[PDB]
Structure 1
Amino acid sequence: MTSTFDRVATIIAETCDIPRETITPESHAIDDLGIDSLDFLDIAFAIDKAFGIKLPLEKWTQEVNDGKATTEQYFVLKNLAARIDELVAAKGALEHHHHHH
């Protein structure tokens, strides 16, 4: 059950004003959804804001550039939701005290 993706696809539907139904977990941001890097910046900011995590989008690009990881691992919605879910479990250890809303 891609419940993290339920949350993320709601966020994209708020940002781009595209219905959540057009956003499937298999969708590649810079292909299927036609989301630019400049558009995905604000989506990534709204995810960062929502879950109380940080998406290191800059370093994720560097992962692809150095061959540490694939571009699809950060720009496909099932795999991005997985990365977010990893960072939610991670931040549970060392999150700074911001009133969760």
Structure 2
Amino acid sequence: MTSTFDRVATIIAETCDIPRETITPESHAIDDLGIDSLDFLDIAFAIDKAFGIKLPLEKWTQEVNDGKATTEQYFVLKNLAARIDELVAAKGALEHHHHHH
């Protein structure tokens, strides 16, 4: 029993050495865990290859710093785990389509 969050949290411990105990689902990877966006690239590429998906990290980070999206929307570990899972669902091409197509 290990969720998408728990996989990510293991990968955070592997990459940037952040204690699993001090990693909550409602934690912000950058603000709360104190991980830089570059260190988060190493985490996100390790996630990327693990789940066999593709995170548009550059897109997510440009939206965040353009004020299109709030930081927490992508960088809170439950929202992040939901984004990854959403792209694992997109990896399987769904059957009810992604948005509408």
If the TM-score is normalised by the length of the shorter chain, which range does it land in? Answer: 0.7 to 0.9
Cα distance in structure 2, aligned partners of 1:75 and 1:81: 9
Deviation per CA, 1:28-52: give whole Å up to 9, x if none.
Answer: 1111100011110100110001001
Cα distance in structure 1, aligned partners of 2:3 and 2:15: 19
Q: Which residue of 2 aligns with 1:98?
A: 98
Q: Which of 60-69 and 11-20 deviates more?
A: 60-69
Cα distance in structure 1, aligned partners of 2:99 and 2:73: 30
CA 23–92 in structure 1, closer or farther in 2 if over 3 Å, else same: same
CA 27–95 in structure 1, closer or farther in 2 if over 3 Å, else same: same
Cα distance in structure 1, aligned partners of 2:63 and 2:99: 32
TM-score, normalising length: structure 2? 0.83
CA 97–80 in structure 1, closer or farther in 2 if over 3 Å, else same: closer
- CA shift, 1:96, in A, is 20
Deviation per CA, 1:77-96: give whole Å up to 9, x if none.
Answer: 11000100100110112999
> Which sections of structure 1, spanning at least 5 residues, go unmatched?
none
Aligned residue pairs total: 101
- CA shift, 1:18, in A, is 2.3
Higher percent of residues as helix: 1
CA 97–60 in structure 1, closer or farther in 2 if over 3 Å, else same: closer
TM-score, normalising length: structure 1? 0.83
CA 35–95 in structure 1, closer or farther in 2 if over 3 Å, else same: farther
